[PDB]
Amino acid sequence: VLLPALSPTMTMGTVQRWEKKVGEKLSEGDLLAEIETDKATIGFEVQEEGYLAKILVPEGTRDVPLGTPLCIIVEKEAD
C-alpha cells in the first residue's frame, strides 16, 4: 500500500488517524485512514481485498511523501 495522489497537485500528506486495526479484514472500500494533505483532510479507503498485517507510518506522522509504504496487506489471514 503506497501513499497515492489523493488530489491532482498533491505531493505529500499526513497520517492523521488510522481507522483500521492491524489484524482486521479489509473489504474494497472500508475507510482505511485519515490523511491530511494541505488541500483537505481526506478519508483514505481500502483498494484491494485483505487483512492488516502491520503499519509502517505511526498515527500522527507528518509530511509523508508520495509512494511511501503505508502498511502491508496479506491475502489469507494466517500471516
Binding site: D30, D38, K39, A40
Partner: peptide, 16 residues
C-alpha cells in the same frame, strides 16, 4: 456500524 469516511469535504488544519 464501523467508522466511515465523511460524506462531505473537510479542510486541512493547516491549509496551503
Amino acid at each position: 456500524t464501523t467508522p466511515e469516511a465523511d460524506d462531505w469535504s473537510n479542510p486541512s488544519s493547516e491549509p496551503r
